[PDB]
Design a protein around this motif. Structure first.
Motif, PDB file in Angstrom:
ATOM      1  N   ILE A  96       0.567   7.694   8.066  1.00  0.00           N
ATOM      2  CA  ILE A  96       1.279   6.800   8.954  1.00  0.00           C
ATOM      3  C   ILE A  96       0.664   5.695   9.283  1.00  0.00           C
ATOM      4  O   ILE A  96      -0.717   6.289   9.753  1.00  0.00           O
ATOM      5  CB  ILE A  96       2.177   7.244  10.115  1.00  0.00           C
ATOM      6  N   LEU A  97       0.619   4.715   8.839  1.00  0.00           N
ATOM      7  CA  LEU A  97      -0.464   3.079  10.279  1.00  0.00           C
ATOM      8  C   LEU A  97       0.526   3.271  11.019  1.00  0.00           C
ATOM      9  O   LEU A  97       1.873   2.367  11.282  1.00  0.00           O
ATOM     10  CB  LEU A  97      -0.444   2.402   9.370  1.00  0.00           C
ATOM     11  N   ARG A  98       0.229   3.871  12.268  1.00  0.00           N
ATOM     12  CA  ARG A  98       0.479   3.733  13.786  1.00  0.00           C
ATOM     13  C   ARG A  98      -0.519   1.967  14.575  1.00  0.00           C
ATOM     14  O   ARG A  98      -1.749   2.645  14.450  1.00  0.00           O
ATOM     15  CB  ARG A  98       0.209   4.898  14.421  1.00  0.00           C
TER      16      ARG A  98
ATOM     17  N   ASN B 221     -12.806   6.037   1.249  1.00  0.00           N
ATOM     18  CA  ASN B 221     -12.281   5.218   1.195  1.00  0.00           C
ATOM     19  C   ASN B 221     -11.825   3.766   2.510  1.00  0.00           C
ATOM     20  O   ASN B 221     -11.743   3.143   2.008  1.00  0.00           O
ATOM     21  CB  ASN B 221     -11.248   5.483   0.225  1.00  0.00           C
ATOM     22  N   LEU B 222     -11.612   4.752   3.793  1.00  0.00           N
ATOM     23  CA  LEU B 222     -11.837   4.397   4.853  1.00  0.00           C
ATOM     24  C   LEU B 222     -13.145   3.937   5.852  1.00  0.00           C
ATOM     25  O   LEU B 222     -12.246   3.605   7.263  1.00  0.00           O
ATOM     26  CB  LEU B 222     -10.328   4.105   5.805  1.00  0.00           C
ATOM     27  N   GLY B 223     -13.798   2.957   5.436  1.00  0.00           N
ATOM     28  CA  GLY B 223     -15.177   2.539   5.869  1.00  0.00           C
ATOM     29  C   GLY B 223     -16.926   3.344   5.530  1.00  0.00           C
ATOM     30  O   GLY B 223     -17.180   1.997   5.746  1.00  0.00           O
TER      31      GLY B 223
ATOM     32  N   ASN C  41       0.487  -1.010  -0.059  1.00  0.00           N
ATOM     33  CA  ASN C  41      -0.031  -0.130  -0.194  1.00  0.00           C
ATOM     34  C   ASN C  41       0.657   1.373   0.052  1.00  0.00           C
ATOM     35  O   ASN C  41       0.381   2.786  -0.929  1.00  0.00           O
ATOM     36  CB  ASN C  41      -0.796   0.067   1.213  1.00  0.00           C
ATOM     37  N   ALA C  42       1.697   1.162   0.834  1.00  0.00           N
ATOM     38  CA  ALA C  42       3.111   2.437   0.618  1.00  0.00           C
ATOM     39  C   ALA C  42       3.664   2.526  -0.379  1.00  0.00           C
ATOM     40  O   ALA C  42       3.825   3.352  -0.445  1.00  0.00           O
ATOM     41  CB  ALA C  42       3.931   1.966   1.657  1.00  0.00           C
ATOM     42  N   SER C  43       3.449   1.610  -1.000  1.00  0.00           N
ATOM     43  CA  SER C  43       4.567   1.487  -1.893  1.00  0.00           C
ATOM     44  C   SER C  43       3.647   2.237  -3.062  1.00  0.00           C
ATOM     45  O   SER C  43       4.422   3.205  -4.715  1.00  0.00           O
ATOM     46  CB  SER C  43       5.156  -0.187  -2.909  1.00  0.00           C
ATOM     47  N   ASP C  44       2.383   1.588  -3.532  1.00  0.00           N
ATOM     48  CA  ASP C  44       1.557   2.211  -4.324  1.00  0.00           C
ATOM     49  C   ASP C  44       0.995   3.516  -3.842  1.00  0.00           C
ATOM     50  O   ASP C  44       1.159   4.600  -4.733  1.00  0.00           O
ATOM     51  CB  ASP C  44      -0.175   1.549  -4.219  1.00  0.00           C
ATOM     52  N   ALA C  45       1.208   3.810  -2.583  1.00  0.00           N
ATOM     53  CA  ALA C  45       1.158   5.217  -2.682  1.00  0.00           C
ATOM     54  C   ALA C  45       2.312   6.329  -2.960  1.00  0.00           C
ATOM     55  O   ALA C  45       1.950   7.194  -3.548  1.00  0.00           O
ATOM     56  CB  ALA C  45       1.251   6.389  -1.554  1.00  0.00           C
ATOM     57  N   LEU C  46       3.606   5.507  -3.024  1.00  0.00           N
ATOM     58  CA  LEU C  46       5.074   6.486  -3.490  1.00  0.00           C
ATOM     59  C   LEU C  46       4.633   6.289  -5.187  1.00  0.00           C
ATOM     60  O   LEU C  46       4.861   7.562  -5.269  1.00  0.00           O
ATOM     61  CB  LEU C  46       6.125   5.089  -3.165  1.00  0.00           C
TER      62      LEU C  46
END
Ligand code: GDM
Length: 214
Positions: free
Chosen positions: A172-174, A92-94, A37-42
């Motif tokens: 950031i995913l915390r 997008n998140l729910g 997901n991070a890579s996709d966002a990048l």
């Protein structure tokens, strides 16, 4: 400031329930999904930057960074990708079931590996294998920094961010790790999961290690 509260679409709530209450063994795939997901966002911000170079100036370095915070039982996965606006986080998140939510659940109950979750476009929710609570902290060039928060309950909160470090740009995913999944705070274990499932990532993956000086 003050939190706004939102209800999860019925399907997403079901999905989280499945995942949070799984005996599943291969829980480590959550990291592959978050890195992807991070890579996709990048990928997104970099492609965007092709015709709008200034977009990069809020954070010129493209990277994925993993930071265990053992004292708080927290694992953070950060990227300097495109980030998400308040409306994106809500939409997008729910609040709107993803195109593949029901189908993944159908597939799961038929015998499908949880690791297929990414092929259904709902791999974000795999973080609930190892965490019982999550904050998604995000800064898009188009908005202020916001905090999206969920404990797998039927509702999530979104709050303007006045408490976390400024992220230039990205997400950031915390993860607030479950008591039985604290192995993912360990440098050796993290390194091993990355090498096994994330060999072909175009961006540097950084690990933040905190060591006492002797
Ligand atoms: C292909 O796009 C992907 C989709 C559509 C997704 C909502 C696109 C989103 O809005 C359009 C942004 O363009 C995109 C850049 C943001 C991310 C990937 C975030 O990741 C980070 N590090 O920013 C991710 O997690 C915080 C947000 C939701 C992910 C979902 C609910 C999921 O379960 N899997 C998904 C993985 C994907 O790659 C997914 O649905």
């Amino acid at each position: 400031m003050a939190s706004e509260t939102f209800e999860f679409q019925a399907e997403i709530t079901q999905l989280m329930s499945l995942i949070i209450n799984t005996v599943y063994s291969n829980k480590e795939i959550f990291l592959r999904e978050l890195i992807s997901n991070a890579s996709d966002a990048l990928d997104r911000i970099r492609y965007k930057s092709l015709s709008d170079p200034k977009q990069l100036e809020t954070e010129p370095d493209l990277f994925i960074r993993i930071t265990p915070k053992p004292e708080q039982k927290v694992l953070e996965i950060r990227d300097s990708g495109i980030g998400m606006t308040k409306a994106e986080l809500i939409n997008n998140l729910g609040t709107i079931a993803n195109s593949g939510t029901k189908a993944f659940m159908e597939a799961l109950s038929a015998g499908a590996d949880v690791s297929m979750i990414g092929q259904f476009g709902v791999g974000f929710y795999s973080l609930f294998l190892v965490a019982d609570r999550v904050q998604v902290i995000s800064k898009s060039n188009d908005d202020e920094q916001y905090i999206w928060e969920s404990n797998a309950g039927g509702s999530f909160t979104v709050t303007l961010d006045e408490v976390n470090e400024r992220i230039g740009r990205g997400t950031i995913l915390r993860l607030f790790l479950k008591d039985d999944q604290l192995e993912y705070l360990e440098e050796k274990r993290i390194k091993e999961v990355i090498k096994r499932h994330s060999e072909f990532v175009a961006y540097p993956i950084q690990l933040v290690v905190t060591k006492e000086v002797e």
